[PDB]
Amino acid sequence: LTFESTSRFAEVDVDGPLKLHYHEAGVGNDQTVVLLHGGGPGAASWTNFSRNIAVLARHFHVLAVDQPGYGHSDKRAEHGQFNRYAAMALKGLFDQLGLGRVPLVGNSLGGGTAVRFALDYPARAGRLVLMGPGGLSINLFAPDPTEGVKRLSKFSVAPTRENLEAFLRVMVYDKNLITPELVDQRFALASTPESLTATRAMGKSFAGADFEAGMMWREVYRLRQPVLLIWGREDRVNPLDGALVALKTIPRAQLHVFGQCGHWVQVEKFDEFNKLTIEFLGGG
Amino acid sequence: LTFESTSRFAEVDVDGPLKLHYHEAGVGNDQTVVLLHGGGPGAASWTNFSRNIAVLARHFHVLAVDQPGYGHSDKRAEHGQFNRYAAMALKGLFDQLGLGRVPLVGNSLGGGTAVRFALDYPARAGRLVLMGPGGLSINLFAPDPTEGVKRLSKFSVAPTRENLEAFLRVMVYDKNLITPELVDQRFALASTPESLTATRAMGKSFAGADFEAGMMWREVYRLRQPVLLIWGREDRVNPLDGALVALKTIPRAQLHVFGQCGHWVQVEKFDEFNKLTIEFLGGG
Amino acid sequence: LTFESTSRFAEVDVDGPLKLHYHEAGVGNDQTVVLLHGGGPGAASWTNFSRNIAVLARHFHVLAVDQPGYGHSDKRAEHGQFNRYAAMALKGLFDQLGLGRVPLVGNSLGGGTAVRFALDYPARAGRLVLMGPGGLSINLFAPDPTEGVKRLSKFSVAPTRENLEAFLRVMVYDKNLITPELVDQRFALASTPESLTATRAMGKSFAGADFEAGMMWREVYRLRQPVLLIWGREDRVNPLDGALVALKTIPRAQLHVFGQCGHWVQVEKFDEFNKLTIEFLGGG
Amino acid sequence: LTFESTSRFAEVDVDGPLKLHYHEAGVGNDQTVVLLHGGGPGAASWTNFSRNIAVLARHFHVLAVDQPGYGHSDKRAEHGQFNRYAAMALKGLFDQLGLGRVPLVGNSLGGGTAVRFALDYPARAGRLVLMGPGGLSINLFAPDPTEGVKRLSKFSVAPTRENLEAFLRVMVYDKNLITPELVDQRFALASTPESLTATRAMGKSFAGADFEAGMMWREVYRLRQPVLLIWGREDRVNPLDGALVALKTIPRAQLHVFGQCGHWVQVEKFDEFNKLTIEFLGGG
Numbered sequence A, B, C, D: 001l002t003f004e005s006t007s008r009f010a011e012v013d014v015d016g017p018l019k020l021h022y023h024e025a026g027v028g029n030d031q032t033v034v035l036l037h038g039g040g041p042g043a044a045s046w047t048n049f050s051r052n053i054a055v056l057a058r059h060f061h062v063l064a065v066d067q068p069g070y071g072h073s074d075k076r077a078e079h080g081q082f083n084r085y086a087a088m089a090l091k092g093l094f095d096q097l098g099l100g101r102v103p104l105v106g107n108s109l110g111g112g113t114a115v116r117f118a119l120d121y122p123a124r125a126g127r128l129v130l131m132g133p134g135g136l137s138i139n140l141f142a143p144d145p146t147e148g149v150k151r152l153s154k155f156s157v158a159p160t161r162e163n164l165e166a167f168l169r170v171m172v173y174d175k176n177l178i179t180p181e182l183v184d185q186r187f188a189l190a191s192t193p194e195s196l197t198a199t200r201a202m203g204k205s206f207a208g209a210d211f212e213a214g215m216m217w218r219e220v221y222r223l224r225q226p227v228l229l230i231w232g233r234e235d236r237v238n239p240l241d242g243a244l245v246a247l248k249t250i251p252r253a254q255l256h257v258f259g260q261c262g263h264w265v266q267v268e269k270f271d272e273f274n275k276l277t278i279e280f281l282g283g284g
């Protein structure tokens, strides 16, 4: 299993042609699962889920989608509320691949997209695994913007290696995971003009009239499927108090919290995350 | 595996002879694990863990201990703070069986005992699994006594089948688990004079000068081992807000919450509980 | 100031003629304030605010309204979602009495109506004082129905003195407030066929398709005015964890919590409550 | 009322002579009240309480004490756990000035000292007013160190104007309060060798064996007096989730939360804070 071998492309319609890049593995397996990566600068599916896709592929047919603005998917200068935008792209991909009701795995921004999708196209979404998800979360005690979000913002205004290293270091409990190579690899991807355009586009999308689409905590009580929430206790981007409204209002919810774990649950506690996901999605 | 076949007895010293009853299974297995049952009226190890001991025995050497005042262990009229009292009994049993550092599994009252033990004899306790544990929990939002505790109290003053049925029904989310047979079986065990003496003894123990031993949330920051907290979202005895101090202050803590689950986690979500416990304790 | 001297009536249009009963005092004063009472059986403005109306009249022009289904207001057999229904009644009264933009004081169900009114007629509502309010509250930790709501339902099914007294005793921290005279007076009002008619209507309205109007926590982020939330720490109907979404999302919110105080804040902490309200509404 | 007119000195014994600086006003008034300031760099009584001392003096005999290590009080190179250390200083001052049992007002670190004083000398402390207090607070959701505490540490390691300004900007909701004059005045006080001496002492005292004296949340259940907790919703040093253990376990506690207010409650909400304190201490 390699990046090149699993790579695939599709063109869908979201107010015009939109190129989506994704990775496909475990093709022969019975159950299809869609993975949606995090939203940090330079983030993409393969690197987001490096410790997970191979293991998950043994039990499931995996589709790891680069969300628009990330990876090798189109990076438009303008778009509406992001999760709905990415959901529309995902809705298009579903019809293309002929998928019915499929479980979704999403961390952070991808979590928000997974949920927005499940609300907008209820018949198409199965079980959810959401790790420190945005949108669905609302920080009842943490003043917004959180420290994590501040460091994201500072990078957007001033995209330097130092600001990106600073951002990555508040993503994780074990800061040794932030290696010089990772910073370099991420900075190289994040600093290109196409990626920086995508970053600005996200910022403007917050000022949209469709902002209420972002506040998914208002709507997830409508979700009928099982939902597994996974959180890092030391998450400084979407801290733990953000899980409570969702945990309360989603009828078939579960929550798992890791101590000594940050926002990057799928990396920091990759083994514990994998087994939990496999079991929750039926063991395939 | 049956009740009679696994049954064992030991005599330990807690300010004099104390008969302890327990169940032993999976004798040939590498890792020893101690189970500590819930504190409801008529509660005991076998019935508390009926859906779990057999499955756990395949991976571990299981010791399911009837805590003093319950099952076939001695039911003294007088004792000090209960968790310390039960811990002293357990401390005695450890030395007798020649045990070193052993992981503890305890729900509700047994959870409180497991924790009190881990604090008082730090070298002797390994990993903890605690389901809706007492003592370690403190209800930050729920007014005390909770509805669950009220129904326990009403039974103590007025031990009738109706009050016990009422108590059992707020133990679980799925009330169909409260079958006529269960109520009858529990009432028969709970209503005997020896068991009712034990119930009164518990009540008086709250008035003790050693009450501070009960408030384990003050001390568990001292715990160095991994601790798995498991909660039912609809727990009406020790509600979910009681997990927060422990989750915060125990350095290597985890928390798992089940939606559509009450205080009896090990029964209501018995499969999910078993696999979680097996994985957390090393898969044996 | 007596019930008789302050008594007033008005007829407004909510899908036809609707009689509203209210109490008026401090007629000469500059600033108008509307009080909206709790939703318990036999509840009405006068008994609900007996400890407050006299004091508030010294500073404000007070209007304490019996909400439809309560007091001497019409008790219809049929109505929609209650808070929207009662708000429509209150809007009609505003126009009749010629009121402009007025601050609102509401505890429990009346809190919900106050909030519902403020959302539906934004130009007409000023500062809000809300005591253990329904609707805007959502219990993030307490399993629903709460102990309070359960005992209300039990009385509704079986309207007996014993069940009402049981209901009343979980309304307050200090149970000595629940005197035989109080139980009898509430029971007499609650046991009339007209009040029983209203109970049936309230029950049926829950099955309505407009239920989402009830979930005001989804909407209060839109409130532009200052809002003072007041809670009893030991509130067993609308517990303290229910304040969190509102405190977070209402931009100019405040929260005051009284220790050793239940659901009936305006009674148990009447003096402290009066001063907070008087100061918060400008000292008049 | 000026810094010069109110200035006073006293020498007390805490393991030897210790100079305490304080401000005294309202000398003729019946009820004495002690103010204990925050722990920021350059912090002292006068600047901390500039918006309050004049107003409080109208009703109370006010004593605003520079805690050791701050203001014009002795800045020793060595000391034990700070709150116990400062409390011992305050106890000596009480005896010298002949005070009996006095209410205490303390924000942040001074809140911790107030609480520490109230626990160690129970007969000497009256009603407590605590604004975003240290020590009694424990952040159940916010990962430690908080954003505020981090920026304080960064300044301590690298005491530069840029780092201090960064620290000051997370003290308040309204950042316009952080003016160039403020940054310069605090930086000048913080940059003196004596203050740098005190910083080193504070840093070293954390490594002490008496650290558990710092964790006052474990002990405040023993407080018998009324305690008014005041918090800014947007407090980024001691966030709102930190109030919960204290609100729960202090029997006669109250909590007031201001929306659109940070860590410096007495400055940002100075008028609302003054009235709450004046009323809470009896109106004098």
Ligand SMILES: O=S(=O)(O)c1cc(Cl)c(O)c(Cl)c1
Residues within 6 Å of the ligand: A037, A038, A039, A040, A041, A043, A107, A108, A109, A134, A148, A149, A152, A171, A237, A263, A264
């Ligand atoms: O770590 S990531 O999951 O890439 C991430 C995603 C979002 Cl949307 C975000 O705001 C931050 Cl700070 C980090």
Ligand SMILES: O=S(=O)(O)c1cc(Cl)c(O)c(Cl)c1
Residues within 6 Å of the ligand: B037, B038, B039, B040, B041, B043, B107, B108, B109, B134, B148, B149, B152, B171, B237, B263, B264
């Ligand atoms: O369900 S049980 O675990 O037996 C249980 C144990 C205790 Cl200590 C308790 O107070 C209640 Cl209400 C129930």
Ligand SMILES: O=S(=O)(O)c1cc(Cl)c(O)c(Cl)c1
Residues within 6 Å of the ligand: C037, C038, C039, C040, C041, C043, C107, C108, C109, C134, C148, C149, C152, C171, C237, C263
């Ligand atoms: O005591 S009251 O404020 O009248 C009250 C109102 C409502 Cl809506 C309720 O459900 C309960 Cl339990 C009590």
Ligand SMILES: O=S(=O)(O)c1cc(Cl)c(O)c(Cl)c1
Residues within 6 Å of the ligand: D037, D038, D039, D040, D041, D043, D107, D108, D109, D134, D148, D149, D152, D171, D237, D263
């Ligand atoms: O602003 S202050 O209240 O002076 C303050 C005191 C302490 Cl102890 C602290 O750690 C911080 Cl970050 C701020």
